[PDB]
Design a protein around this ligand. Sequence first.
Ligand SMILES: Cc1cc2nc3c(=O)[nH]c(=O)nc-3n(C[C@H](O)[C@H](O)[C@H](O)COP(=O)(O)OP(=O)(O)OC[C@H]3O[C@@H](n4cnc5c(N)ncnc54)[C@H](O)[C@@H]3O)c2cc1C
Length: 127
Amino acid sequence: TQQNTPLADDTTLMSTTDLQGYITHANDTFVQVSGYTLQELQGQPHNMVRHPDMPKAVFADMWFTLKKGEPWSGIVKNRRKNGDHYWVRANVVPMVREGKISGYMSIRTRATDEEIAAVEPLYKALN
Ligand SMILES: Cc1cc2nc3c(=O)[nH]c(=O)nc-3n(C[C@H](O)[C@H](O)[C@H](O)COP(=O)(O)OP(=O)(O)OC[C@H]3O[C@@H](n4cnc5c(N)ncnc54)[C@H](O)[C@@H]3O)c2cc1C
């Protein structure tokens, strides 16, 4: 199925990746919503969650901003294990340890559907 899974108001997905984007930890809500357990996520890139409809230009601008040491945010469409889609607004922030960017943490809330209708014409003009 490709249908939408409506998320609750308190939905707060949080995860941590290394400098190459491979997941190092994931909170319990990310495990429940994504359908993947913690051990299946650890040591895996964050693209197993990526929905194929998401443009390449969205992630290219994120890593350009992240590699500059700056935080990034945007409306993201994700994919579950069964394959249902759910929109979020990712808030990826570079993690700094001893003056060095050690990784990136992100807190993903539920996307208001009005942010979806504003990027869908832009997303089909991006990829
Ligand atoms: C903390 C964190 C949380 C994330 N959460 C999500 C999430 O919830 N959903 C989601 O879909 N993605 C998420 N991502 C992005 C994920 O890691 C992938 O980069 C994304 O899915 C795109 O990878 P891809 O190979 O599928 O597409 P690609 O074809 O690789 O993406 C297009 C462009 O992305 C750029 N890019 C991707 N990875 C890198 C990299 N490591 N270094 C430099 N440039 C790069 C390249 O310029 C490339 O041309 C997250 C990343 C981080 C760091």
